[PDB]
Design a protein around this ligand. Structure first.
Ligand SMILES: [Au+]
Length: 124
């Protein structure tokens, strides 16, 4: 079965300098990573940093998660990311997305032992 740590990687890690694709990056990625499979996942962020730099976030700035838990962590440096946000007219199984490139500080929830990222909470 898929670990929560592996799920975070499948859903969010795209180690590159920035978004590369042949066609709209979110439409392609959201699909290739299985995020359009049982529903159009409505919002999702990919991170173009090494796994190691992202994992390191778990021992950086502790912040409250959006859901009230306290195991969220904010990166000290900005990271290169891409937000995928589903369009108005997008409708499962015909998922379509707006692609927005950014450099922001990322916030993840970390869990387990090893204590690694498992959810993407926000960017700031
Ligand atoms: Au996630």
């Amino acid at each position: 079965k898929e670990t929560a740590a592996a799920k975070f990687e499948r859903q969010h890690m795209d180690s590159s300098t920035s978004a590369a694709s042949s066609s709209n990056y979110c439409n392609q990625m959201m699909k290739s990573r299985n995020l359009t499979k049982d529903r159009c996942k409505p919002v999702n962020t990919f991170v173009h940093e090494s796994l190691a730099d992202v994992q390191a976030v778990c021992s950086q700035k502790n912040v409250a998660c959006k859901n009230g838990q306290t195991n969220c962590y904010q990166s000290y440096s900005t990271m290169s990311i891409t937000d995928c946000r589903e369009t108005g007219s997008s409708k499962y199984p015909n998922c379509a997305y707006k692609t927005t490139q950014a450099n922001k500080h990322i916030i993840v929830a970390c869990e387990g032992n090893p204590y690694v990222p498992v959810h993407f909470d926000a960017s700031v």
